[model samples]
Target chain A: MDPFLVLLHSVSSSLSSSELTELKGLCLGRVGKRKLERVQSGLDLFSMLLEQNDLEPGHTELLRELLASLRRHDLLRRVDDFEA
Target chain B: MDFSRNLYDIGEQLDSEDLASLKFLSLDYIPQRKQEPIKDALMLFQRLQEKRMLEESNLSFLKELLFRINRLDLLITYLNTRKEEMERELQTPGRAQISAYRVMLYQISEEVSRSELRSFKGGLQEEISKCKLDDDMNLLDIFIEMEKRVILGEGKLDILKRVCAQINKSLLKIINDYEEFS
Candidate 1:
């Protein structure tokens, strides 16, 4: 698995249920929500972000920044380990 | 009063009084085995009130004791009572007023640096780095875990309540500490 994806899951595991729901809302937008089976549920959003053909350049950096803002810098640092 | 909140009322968070109340709420005071949560809390708060830094200590065991005894509601009520007392103090002048607003950042910064969270990582450089206030406050990760476990509703209710209350207490102190330094 991609290291960033692993960190995403690790951080999600640490989140409170409400925060998990909040993060899901922030990361997974319309199409992702529908694919959530009309539940508006989930992330594996990093999985989407890492999809090379999908995001514009600099988006990955924004994703990392967003994770840090959510106080998941613990996971962001781990993601850095993979990059290193 | 607002038990429904997972965080403080939007912008408001716990202050030193609230932190004291929370700690007192869950403190252990065993006579048989000779535990004294109140005495310890008093000592610590007295130092803090005096603008003196405290030696770092672990509070998890206190929370565990409160959890075992199912005293979260008592703690909650105690917290409310403390808040009321502080409000009354705020009305008066002198030491009480000074106690209410005394700057505590120096003490908290020292405490965070010495906290067990400073031992979180394994790398030699990482160990040194964890001493940084920025890195050390991640000790609030305990708050993160406490929050989820409380909301997940799998543990003793009193334990969950105490944990939740401590989360607020700890987070509030960290925020205030940052506010003072920044």
Candidate 2:
């Protein structure tokens, strides 16, 4: 898999139920009046957000918060590793 | 072609006054919200024919209706028309986008009917309106909701597969429509 896909897979596999809900809520808030209106899951929101716009510093911060909430520090490390 | 003349033939079958007085078909009646607008609309057309209100010439009316809605592709589908030539003349961007969404919704309706998606009450139209997280949220936003399920394995297995298939098919159609025009 591509590095991006790999990262996505890891985070998706790691999300817990309540954590998943909160993560989805976070993404829903992020969607705003922008083109993104719906997402099936947190993972979908994450992937779509990346697709709609290039990664930015703010996105990096949001991802950190999302990953922390999901309790997937391992996935976060993988993302940071990919960035490095 | 002969098909084009059928409209006039049906028109002749009906009284001229009623035919003339009959309100022109609204562009909105094309039934975008249904999973099978073609199938669903055909039922109404058939019923109209049985009641003798539909003229054969009016069959061509559907073709015109599609054109008015900017969906020449669908118009070609109902008629035995030229493909390559129509492709050149009838390309409309975003027309396929709505159709694609409709197809996905249609498939979802089928699955929902079978009790595949238990929690998902009502149809795609209801769900789209009900789940509109914001005023600006459109069908594409709803499209992502299903996308999320595909990623996480939340929805029913079979329904999810079919939804994914319809989504892919719809997206392909949109791409093909653009390619046709381009």
Candidate 3:
């Protein structure tokens, strides 16, 4: 599996339903409303992001900012690990 | 990078509140109905692009909007510019995207106090009879009503001047300065 996809899966699997909602809210401008409504889980959200060309390999700043805004420091650590 | 790409990057930094403020400030250039569906800053930027108000070489309106919203950090970080730099650029002829009339009306809206709104309504009783002027309506609302009545618009300030002279004489200076410059 691709490292970026693995990283996305790992980080997204840990998000709670409420956390996923918060993440979706933060993505208002970056993602379309119709697409975001279908995002039920972290994986679903990340998949939509990937499809929209908003998330991709070696370019995770948008994800980083979303995580930071959510104050998920532990999840951010996971992202940092992948970057390293 | 291109203007669209840069706009996306900048949009990434702004939250919902910032987007709302940008939309509010853009009311003069972008109509309220057209701006209603804009869910994000990037979409608003696209609308501005369609209007030829935003371009790579001419980012004066974007810079001015950011300045008005006090997002100077974005100006410095993204545009590699500052307030003084924008001031100088806007001073040049034909460089500003926002009209002087709009800027003056916005300025007047900001300065009009709660009490003054009452007198402003009183002063325009006859002209405002055709429209709704609730207590909740701000100066911007009044300005819009006046615009609808054809009493206030670009290069049309006689009625505004007369009203301001009654409510607040000081606001006349803002209108006068705009007139002198135009």
Per-residue CA lDDT of candidate 3, range B1-182, in tens? 57667888777777665675577667767887898899977788889889887788877778888877667877998899978997788778887666666666766777767788888888877876746557766666667777887887786789989998888778988878888886
- In the order shown, the candidates' Cα RMSDs to the true structure are 19.9, 19.7, 8.2
True contacts kept of each: 0.00, 0.00, 0.00
Give the candidate number with the greatest DockQ.
Answer: 3
- Residue runs of model 1 more than 4 Å from their true location after superposition: A1-5, A28-32, A36-43, A48-59, B1-182
Q: How many residue pairs clash in each candidate?
A: 0, 13, 0
Superior by lDDT: candidate 1 or candidate 2: 2
Give the alpha-carbon lDDT of every model.
0.39, 0.45, 0.78
Q: For residues A9-76, could you state the per-residue lDDT of candidate 2 as single tens digits?
A: 66677767676667766665554322233444556666656533323333466677667766777877
lDDT computed for candidate 2: 0.45
Candidate 2 structure quality by residue, lDDT tens digits, B71-116: 3333343455544544444365543322333333333332221132
Question: Clashing residue pairs, candidate 3?
Answer: none
**lDDT at B111 for candidate 2?**
24
lDDT (0-100) at residue A13 of candidate 2? 71
Docking class of 2: incorrect
Worst 10 residues of 2 chain A by lDDT: A31-40
Each model's TM-score, in the order given? 0.24, 0.29, 0.58
Q: How far off is residue A7 in model 3, in Å?
A: 30
